[PDB]
Amino acid sequence: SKAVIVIPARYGSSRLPGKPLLDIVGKPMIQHVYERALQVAGVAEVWVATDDPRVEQAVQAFGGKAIMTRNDHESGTDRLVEVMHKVEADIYINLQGDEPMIRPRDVETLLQGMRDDPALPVATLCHAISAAEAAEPSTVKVVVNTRQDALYFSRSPIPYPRNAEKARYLKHVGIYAYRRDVLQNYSQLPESMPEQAESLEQLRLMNAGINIRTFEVAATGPGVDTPACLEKVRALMAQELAENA
Amino acid sequence: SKAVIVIPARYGSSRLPGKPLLDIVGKPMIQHVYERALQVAGVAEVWVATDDPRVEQAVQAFGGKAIMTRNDHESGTDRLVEVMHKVEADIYINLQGDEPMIRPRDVETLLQGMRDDPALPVATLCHAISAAEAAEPSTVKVVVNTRQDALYFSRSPIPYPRNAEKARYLKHVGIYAYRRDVLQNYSQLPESMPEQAESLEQLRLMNAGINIRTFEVAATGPGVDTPACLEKVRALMAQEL
Numbered sequence A: 001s002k003a004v005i006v007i008p009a010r011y012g013s014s015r016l017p018g019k020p021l022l023d024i025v026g027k028p029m030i031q032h033v034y035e036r037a038l039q040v041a042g043v044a045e046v047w048v049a050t051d052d053p054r055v056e057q058a059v060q061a062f063g064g065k066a067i068m069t070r071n072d073h074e075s076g077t078d079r080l081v082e083v084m085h086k087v088e089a090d091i092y093i094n095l096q097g098d099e100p101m102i103r104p105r106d107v108e109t110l111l112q113g114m115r116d117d118p119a120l121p122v123a124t125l126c127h128a129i130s131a132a133e134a135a136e137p138s139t140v141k142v143v144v145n146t147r148q149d150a151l152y153f154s155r156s157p158i159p160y161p162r163n164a165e166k167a168r169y170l171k172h173v174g175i176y177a178y179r180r181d182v183l184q185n186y187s188q189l190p191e192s193m194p195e196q197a198e199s200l201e202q203l204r205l206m207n208a209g210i211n212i213r214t215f216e217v218a219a220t221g222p223g224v225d226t227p228a229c230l231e232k233v234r235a236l237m238a239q240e241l242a243e244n245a
Numbered sequence B: 001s002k003a004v005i006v007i008p009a010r011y012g013s014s015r016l017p018g019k020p021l022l023d024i025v026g027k028p029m030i031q032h033v034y035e036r037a038l039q040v041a042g043v044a045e046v047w048v049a050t051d052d053p054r055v056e057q058a059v060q061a062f063g064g065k066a067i068m069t070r071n072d073h074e075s076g077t078d079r080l081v082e083v084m085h086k087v088e089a090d091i092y093i094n095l096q097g098d099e100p101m102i103r104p105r106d107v108e109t110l111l112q113g114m115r116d117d118p119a120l121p122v123a124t125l126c127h128a129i130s131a132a133e134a135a136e137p138s139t140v141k142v143v144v145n146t147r148q149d150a151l152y153f154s155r156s157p158i159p160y161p162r163n164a165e166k167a168r169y170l171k172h173v174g175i176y177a178y179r180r181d182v183l184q185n186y187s188q189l190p191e192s193m194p195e196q197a198e199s200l201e202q203l204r205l206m207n208a209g210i211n212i213r214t215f216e217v218a219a220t221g222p223g224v225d226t227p228a229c230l231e232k233v234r235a236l237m238a239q240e241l
């Protein structure tokens, strides 16, 4: 079973132009993600999928593998489908190019899950959050059954807190592992009403009856989207270097 | 493929004690439900499951069939499980004893669905509602996939209206059809965290991975929970004549 990690990294961003190129303790953000991806056991290759030459150059400059993709791509899953045709693997892992604090062990958990169950099409991550955090529409919640399969994903707080003290919330961590056949049949799936309403691409899979197992990990480090969280990551990353001396 | 309709009708109610015996244009509420149930094609028997001798006698008075069940059941579902042991069938339909405006056609849609797919364990109903109505925690919303299987049931407005004009909402109508094997295993299913938090018993099935197909019907009539709804139903069933 061959597994590869693909890191989508488009330059264009409204509140952070050239987001993957921002410096974090001396290296572009995209490099930190790539370096951590390389530490994931069981992965054959790591690639960066981009639609901008500057990103491709920055990646090659540190010796990373870059593959140009179409800029007309609406989603990071469509971009991964294009990569799938050129890069062969049985399992593709999609990592966010803007989460430099990703833990290699979490990707291994995800990979081990896919290998322990040959029938599993998609796998993703989640971690426990408080009810107060779950109230945010910018945070995606997920509810799972006993096998840890996702029942639904939503920006609405689910489960509804009728008996508030009994409610436990899970935040969805946007890292995915897809079997090859899922990506091959992907472009034929129609957009679902819940997907368009919620603006959550993963609901397109659920509409088609494709199971998504969700593994729970510890609270993940802060992503980068706000210049405030950027400074926190910078200090958190720097605090990490001195800790491992 | 033998199907039976079971109507849970406990005497008690915090807002309307003796609810099944309340008069609605000449007949107790339970009789209206029982008569409409008898109009459902494809069913072999209709039973009223109750805990009180007063309800049992009232049903026998109009010629219906009734079975005494334990008074310690927490829900009509548990009451149905007790009945399944006494009344043998392949498919059991659970009708609410407080919804006298039930349309026989809607129960036939549900039954047809179960017969069209022998692999389907549970089926239920739903109908379109507005965004305004979906915002209410007392209204249970359901989201389904292309095969109409339910993804989740919630009091929260699902789907979240990020793009409001794209959102379409469905209200769950508490009528169920269960295959016998689901009921034989029901007592072994543990309660789920989502069930306890939302206070929705059907989430106990989803937690165990049991599929629930949801068929869509037109807007249904109100049930009788409060004395206000009781007066509204009386008014509606009167003009319906």
Ligand SMILES: Nc1ccn([C@@H]2O[C@H](COP(=O)(O)O)[C@@H](O)[C@H]2O)c(=O)n1
Binding pocket: B007, B008, B009, B010, B011, B013, B073, B074, B075, B076, B079, B095, B096, B097, B098, B225
């Ligand atoms: N313990 C319980 C609770 C409810 N039920 C039944 O469930 C249906 C709807 O519930 P409520 O009227 O209690 O709200 C009624 O037909 C009622 O008799 C039951 O049979 N046993």
